[PDB]
Amino acid sequence: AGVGTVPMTDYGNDIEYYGQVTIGTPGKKFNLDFDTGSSDLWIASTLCTNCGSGQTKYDPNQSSTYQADGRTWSISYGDGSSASGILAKDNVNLGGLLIKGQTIELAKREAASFASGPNDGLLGLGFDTITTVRGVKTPMDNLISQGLISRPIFGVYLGKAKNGGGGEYIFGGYDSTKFKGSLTTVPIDNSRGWWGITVDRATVGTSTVASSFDGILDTGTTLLILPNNIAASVARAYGASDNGDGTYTISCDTSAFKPLVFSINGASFQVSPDSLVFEEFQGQCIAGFGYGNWGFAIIGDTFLKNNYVVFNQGVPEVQIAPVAE
């Protein structure tokens, strides 16, 4: 694997994607979820009292480069999960790039969904205006300032379980084998600390199911979550039925569905028919799109496993192109 190249592991039916990170000296490998919707780097530690027995835990005592920090932290994600603990400092090796002196957040407590998932913690890739502790420099901030990347970018390829899973993150570069055509440049709004974009319209066949709306590119959100009127409008196009819990029940037979097409900055990006079905349970299928009571959409893995994204922290802007498949 090339410099700053991190091969990802697809968990379940495109639930999430994690990669290995080496923390400490001599260091241990941690499977972290790469999240563009958050900016805190936290990991399960031996200070943890409700952590999974399966999780790999960071042990201060076994890293000769650990440095104590008197600050505490606590986070609350949008799916109701959380974690809390203490700050510390150590070295993080991301794809061969050794970030020296990264602020790592060691978990003392964590939600049970963390304890039972595949992750040892999270790597956040949002802007630093949203770190939970003021003054923390995120890993991207550090790669740039330590000169480990020459371009303030990361290229993201998320695979489809249907095709073998996988995925790959490249810090300071991108891979044109993973996409097709020309990249489209889309300006980013980071005023709320996220990768915000504007979708000009959404169509299904010849029907305009939605006009322009804002969304955030979130690699760490499984589905495409839309504001209530938009979701409703999309579901009507597919005969999906509201399960009343932010999810829809859709036909398992996607063969007749037309793709959901997003018009972003003049180009067409889609959610292929197959991605319209998230999961099949005892012959009932959950749709790849859901609803939330937000004015903005959460453009999650349903969309990202269909379109390659180059994230530029410097401008900021993104470059999108249809995945090559």
Partner: peptide, 6 residues
């Protein structure tokens, strides 16, 4: 599902 710092 999972929905990461809202």
């Amino acid at each position: 599902x999972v929905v990461x710092a809202x």
